[PDB]
Amino acid sequence: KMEELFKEHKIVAVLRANSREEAIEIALAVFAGGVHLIEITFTVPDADEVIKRLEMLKRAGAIIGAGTVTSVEQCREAVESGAEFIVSPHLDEEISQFCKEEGVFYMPGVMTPTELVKAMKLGHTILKLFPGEVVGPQFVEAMKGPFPNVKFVPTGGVNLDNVCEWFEAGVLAVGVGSALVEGKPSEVAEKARRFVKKIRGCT
Amino acid sequence: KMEELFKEHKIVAVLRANSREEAIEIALAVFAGGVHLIEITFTVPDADEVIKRLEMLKRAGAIIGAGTVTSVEQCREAVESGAEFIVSPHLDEEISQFCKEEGVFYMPGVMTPTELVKAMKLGHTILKLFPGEVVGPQFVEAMKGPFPNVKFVPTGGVNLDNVCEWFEAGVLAVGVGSALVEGKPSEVAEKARRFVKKIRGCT
Amino acid sequence: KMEELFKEHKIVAVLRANSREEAIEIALAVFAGGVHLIEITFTVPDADEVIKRLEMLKRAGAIIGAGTVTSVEQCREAVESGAEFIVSPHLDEEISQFCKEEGVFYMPGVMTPTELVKAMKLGHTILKLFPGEVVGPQFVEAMKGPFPNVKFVPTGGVNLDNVCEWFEAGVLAVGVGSALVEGKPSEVAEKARRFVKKIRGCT
Amino acid sequence: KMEELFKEHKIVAVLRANSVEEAISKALAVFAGGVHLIEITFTVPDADQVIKELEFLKEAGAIIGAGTVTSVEQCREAVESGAEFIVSFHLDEEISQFCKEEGVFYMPGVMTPTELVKAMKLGHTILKLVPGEVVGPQFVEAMKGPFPNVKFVPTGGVNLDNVCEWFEAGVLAVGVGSALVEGEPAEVAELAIRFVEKIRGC
Amino acid sequence: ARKMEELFKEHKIVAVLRANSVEEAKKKALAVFLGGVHLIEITFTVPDADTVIKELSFLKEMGAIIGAGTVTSVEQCREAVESGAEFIVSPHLDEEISQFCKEEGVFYMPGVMTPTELYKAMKLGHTILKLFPGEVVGPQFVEAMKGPFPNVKFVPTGGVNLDNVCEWFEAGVLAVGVGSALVEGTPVEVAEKAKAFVEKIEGC
Amino acid sequence: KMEELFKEHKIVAVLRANSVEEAISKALAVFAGGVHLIEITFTVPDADQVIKELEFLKEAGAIIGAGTVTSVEQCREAVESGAEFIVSFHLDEEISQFCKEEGVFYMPGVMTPTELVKAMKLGHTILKLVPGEVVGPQFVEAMKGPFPNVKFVPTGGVNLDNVCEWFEAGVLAVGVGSALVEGEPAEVAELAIRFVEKIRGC
Amino acid sequence: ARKMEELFKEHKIVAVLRANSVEEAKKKALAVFLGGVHLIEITFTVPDADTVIKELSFLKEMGAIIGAGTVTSVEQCREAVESGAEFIVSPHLDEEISQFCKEEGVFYMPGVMTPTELYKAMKLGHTILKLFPGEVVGPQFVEAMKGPFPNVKFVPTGGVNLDNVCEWFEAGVLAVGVGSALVEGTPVEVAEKAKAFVEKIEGC
Amino acid sequence: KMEELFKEHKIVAVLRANSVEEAISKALAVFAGGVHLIEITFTVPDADQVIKELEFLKEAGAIIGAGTVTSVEQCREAVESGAEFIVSFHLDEEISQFCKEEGVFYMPGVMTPTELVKAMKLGHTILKLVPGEVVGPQFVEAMKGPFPNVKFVPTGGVNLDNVCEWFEAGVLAVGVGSALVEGEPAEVAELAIRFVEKIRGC
Amino acid sequence: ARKMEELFKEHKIVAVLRANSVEEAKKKALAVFLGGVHLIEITFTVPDADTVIKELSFLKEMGAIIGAGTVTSVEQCREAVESGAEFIVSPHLDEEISQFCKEEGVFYMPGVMTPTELYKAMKLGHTILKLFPGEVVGPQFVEAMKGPFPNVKFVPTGGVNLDNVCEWFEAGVLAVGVGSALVEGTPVEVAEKAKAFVEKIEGC
């Protein structure tokens, strides 16, 4: 159950790479850093050939999903490859219906009041807020009032200086697609440890 | 006519409460403070009991509506309860058509250029801008150019320091659902006086 | 080919006027300042009389289009008048079909991820960001990961101090609807030169 | 330099207006049309206002001087006003001394061989030939024999219809004035474009 | 002698007279006078011109205005002045004659052809210039000079006939000097020609 | 502590590489797989680069020592490198003095009873048994009779198929080395996981 | 040197010769002479103009007269005089050249275009004047100056060809200055053109 | 003598117990079964009680010594206790001096050629080979080539199934230990008999 | 005496000879020599080994290499050296013998079995070690020691026969010592066995 997994870890790797090899080296650096929730953006060359080969980490408690899924064809490949969850940059309907039938956790992207309501009426209680750096924590606070039953996972602009502010506002988890991926495997692992300690400290 | 009432008062209470009893007592404290335009968020326990039992203030010049309406069922109840106007956090189609048939003033929520245009094509000349604290007065200034016939009522992010800035940009009225409602009645009425003086001074 | 022209000049006049005489005087001041890409907001009284008249400058290397087109009827008139391209404040469906059939370059307005995706699926590789001053360069920075093949032309929020910042984020061109139009013809031409020099300096 | 500018542009516009604002609107339309050499008549009302107001065009590559300067006092004022060159209708020793000292390019007007073999002695190689409509292209060509080292910028008698013919006779540039400097700013720009394109060919 | 400007404006035509004798000059002067031409210029190309100028003084009381032309020296000018000429006209610009005429209070109109000569004439205080030969440059010269010389009036001589006498004035001309087109043939023919010139001018 | 760490993890990986970058990639895969005890062979090319580079893993709970150290000079370098423990293939009194003074855990290698009852005299309770392929688990079990207070960490002859058998004989930890440390980082991590899963059971 | 008036009157046509070399100038001078044109002007726009003038002196015994043209300075004039030039011709009116020529006793013909210097030229003692360019000022000038300047002889230069040569002579000009129309092409062609000019002039 | 006793009996039983009474019951069962050479483990609890209690067996022709002696102090105690011979796992010059002075038969343990050609120098002709299950009978036979004058009493890896094979390799006696010394006294006696009967044949 | 390393590599086989007499030793030593085994080790288990070494010296000229084995003392070594032995071999590691042999310039190859002994042997400067008994540890030992001892070569003795003699070399072996598998039976049988061993070794 993804809802419980998100609460337990409160952070997502949001992995990006330009190759199969980079994606694997990064995934190991991140996982070893204490970050269990990992998704691979479906832009990585042969991204599906990476997801299917991280089964070994699932056995270690890792959760492997796929990100930046914009169409159902990409979703179908990700699901067949063993993706545990699907994340979109926007709010589709075709992907949602497909995932629903398959039983795959799906999280649509939103930014506006109308997108929120539409997604809510489709049974989505967890929404991805993107770009998060544009609207900021005030968006979540504003929505909390009229929509107390909607949880958010903001992605982008998240760093060690403002990660606690997001949690103070009240979020489920934070997506870090820069400070938790850029650099060498040895550097990434260090960054991962800083994020885990900082989040645990504040919450 | 709501258009004239908004121009005359330039302020909306945007009331919230955790109970039927609180909503009534607060509404009176606010009205006594010089704020005639009051809407009750339709999330308050027994909100319909509150609205229908304030049918005494209308004779005093009070205007009573219902806000945070997301469904047609909520709208229908609010209208039956004697609500003069309906305000939504989003742009619906069903509520709008219902209100038109009933003859009830309706104000949809918008945030984007597309949402604005769609609402405009439905005959809405006054739009609710929400969250106001995210986009700020610059949004209104930008829209003034291409959409000179569209008026805004921003809600949220409004306080005694920046209220004149909103009016300088050019708005119809300001929705204050925090700075003028939080606390207890003996303080809320005083806050109301400061808001009235500040708005009157600048405009 | 407009795509190449935008890249070469990197700046758009975004002309606005209260009369045909003003529009002509401004267009000459701007063109003389080194700004070849000029679009006329189709709100100017007898705007079509300006578009058809300034066609004389096409021989001089000027490119003249029409902006602030909200409906197909306005588009049709602008195209008949000799407009080379059409720019909308929002993302329509009817205008793009008309323009496609005519072979007229069309650039829709967007603000949110959903709009970006919808427009992308309609074959639009260049999008207008409006209002630009609300989202800022951070929107462009974000929309590079999931959308590596989408170019943007922000309008508004552009001045002589932050023009380089926009290009650093990575934009195709900048629309200046204030500092490149307000003032006397002798002042406008001077402002235009400063914009050109600053852009050439940084890029 | 100037000589190089005449070779590069080959055309001079002469502005005359009943106001400063009018002069600016026309000057801008002319510049936009592709004409960088602008002469401001200095015998007009006000006069000492237009040169200053058009200063902003210099940064755009415009070169602005003072036309119909007939006296030394007018010349001095024109130079102080920011004129980069002085143009007259007759040869004057005092002007061809003050301008020299100040580093200001000056060109006298001529009509006969006897005026030509005088300006040359003072050191003038570029002469303004007037009235162009009286002497015609024949003057420019005929004088080339004995005076192959003299260049002309004739004014008057020149329009699009015969602009090529003037260049065939052999001139450095043509002064067309009101030929393109007339009507609304839009019309001025249109005519300026036609002249530039017409010349760029022969 | 500034009154000449007004007199030229009133008549707009000058008869230039040449002859082989006094009697011929006298008959021609009367013929143009009767024909409506009151501005009579007697040249000195005729070796009896002084006699003609003096004798014709009888017409002054009848409203005739008599002067002398083709004066090419100060000494000749002096004789013209003594003869009773009201105005002196020269084919060229001449400082020595101008200064003499100025001192004697005699109206003088120098001849010019080029912009540089027009300029020099201004320093002598001349507001009216004779354009000669008019047939070489034509009316376009007068128009061309309005720019640099907005306050200078011209009186062209030659190139003027009944076919173009009207258009000559469109250039902003004060008066026209007419030669053999006006003065030639019998006294009767001269008077008839004079009538034709006056009638056409007084109308356009 | 070390003695407790061996008891808790029960597995030690031994890394070798032809480059530092290779060593780091493998070390990370091994750690990710759940193996916290890492031995870096100190007889490799460069050698004194890998221990420093892997410093970042220590913060994650990794323990890194130096393998196949035979000389005191190598021990000194390994200690300066920040090695947490030193492991050899033979018993040496000078090494079992330097390491003691520096507070650095050290364990000698043994193969026979006469070496076992010597290392004990020097205060060693944990011995490295080599070659595992030659003596087998029977050596470990048999020696536990007369010497119940001696623990072994046998290296070599250890695979998934017989990893439990070694623990049945009675060892504190097993030295797997190349048994899992081979192939691509992805393959290394998989094998590291399999060993951990297999051990957790007996 | 009044003999020049007689020579201009008798020969009527004067050839104006230009070249980029001495060798070409010589070939042309000979062709022109053989064609029946005795009056030859060697311009100063040719390299080693002095060499050209001197080396053609052999034609003097054949009845040829060699002068120098396009002289714009006293120094150039002196060099031409020292080369045996019979006469000096200038494009303009020049007092310094005139005085030099008078002292040397060399015939000088200044250039004019307007009535004003025409007057001055007379006062300097010059009765024969060069009218230039003839491409701009036509025969109407000659048939006009006669009035005020009845004793001036003109020699129009330029604008003269085989079609209008009679028109100039009908105006009473002393001589015509012809270049390019006569002096062009090969030595044979030049002589042939020169013959054509002479024959037509004699016939009118 | 000992040397003669090994040749005569060809078998040694090694006893271990958690009590003195247990040791006695087993010792008697083993002796009754026909095994006269008894080695008492001296690393047991109490230890210095069993040798004295079994004194009564000496009169029956039993020969009782002490095994698993690793230290000099243990050796001294074992001799004082009435042990007639001392057996160790390693060669020790202090033990192979005290025992010599006291007239006590002693044999060191060996596993390698470098230990064998050392004990021989001190005068040991009978060596204990350990662990027998690690080297096997091939060691005894192979070493007979270069060292034909060395006899072994291997312990470990010895059972009824292969007891003859050990004698074929060429040993003076076999150390069986727990091979027969296990279970109830009745079972111990039975196994003791089986070993005696099996050996008497090859 | 480093040349021994090359000699071992060239032949890859050593005969380990034992006998109960000088006659048996000579016949057996010759039989293997004839069969192609040049490297012959004479043990001291033979009660005339010194005599055997001396008497067989005649084979040295034929390419035979004669040394002595099973040396367990310095005094015994001394006799072997005096007898003409080129190399000394021991079943164990012995410092006293090594030092003696080193001083005398005699190649000495000590026996080892465990990693600690391999290490100690390095302090004496040995590069070639005898592994004995080979059958106890097997080829896996030689491979295992390549890590810690990358510069040490081995010569396994014992456990070597025609069913594994080739395979032994796959472990990275310099040469193999063969006992009764090679030296046993009649002079004829011994020579035949020697040929079989050499023929099979030459392959892997």
Residue numbers in the entry:
A (entry chain G), B (entry chain E), C (entry chain C): 2 to 204
D (entry chain B), F (entry chain I), H (entry chain F): 2 to 203
E (entry chain A), G (entry chain D), I (entry chain H): 20 to 223
Task: Give me lines lifted from the publication on this model.
Here, inspired by the pseudosymmetry observed in bacterial microcompartments and viral capsids, we developed a hierarchical computational method for designing large pseudosymmetric self-assembling protein nanomaterials. We computationally designed pseudosymmetric heterooligomeric components and used them to create discrete, cage-like protein assemblies with icosahedral symmetry containing 240, 540 and 960 subunits. At 49, 71 and 96 nm diameter, these nanocages are the largest bounded computationally designed protein assemblies generated to date. Here we show that designing pseudosymmetric protein building blocks, in which symmetry is broken at the sequence level while backbone symmetry is maintained, enables the construction of very large pseudosymmetric protein nanocages.
Unexpectedly, in a number of the GI4-F7 micrographs we also observed a 71-nm nanocage with a similar wireframe morphology and hexagonal pores. By counting the hexagonal pores we found that h = 3; thus the nanocage is T = 9 and we refer to it as GI9-F7. GI9-F7 can be explained by the presence of small amounts of ABB heterotrimer in AAB heterotrimer preparations. Analogous to the AAB heterotrimer, which forms a pentasymmetron through five roughly two-fold-symmetric A:A interfaces inherited from I3-01, the ABB heterotrimer forms a two-trimer ‘disymmetron’ structure held together by the same A:A interaction. In GI9-F7 this disymmetron occupies the icosahedral two-fold symmetry axes, providing the edges that connect three-fold-symmetric facets containing three ABB heterotrimers and three CCC homotrimers. As a result, GI9-F7 is quasisymmetric in addition to being pseudosymmetric: the A, B and C subunits each occupy multiple, distinct environments in the assembly. The asu of GI9-F7 therefore comprises one AAB trimer, one ABB trimer and one CCC trimer. Micrographs of SEC-purified GI9-F7 assemblies revealed enrichment of the target assembly, and we determined a cryo-EM structure of the nanocage to 6.7 Å resolution applying icosahedral symmetry, as well as a 4.0 Å resolution structure of the asu. Consistent with the accuracy with which we designed GI4-F7, the GI9-F7 cryo-EM structure deviates from the design model by only 11.5 Å Cα r.m.s.d. across all 540 subunits, 1.6% of the nanocage diameter, and superimposition of the designed asu with the structure yields a Cα r.m.s.d. of 4.6 Å across all 9 chains. As a result, the two designed nanocage interfaces (B:C and A:A) occupy five quasi-equivalent positions in GI9-F7.
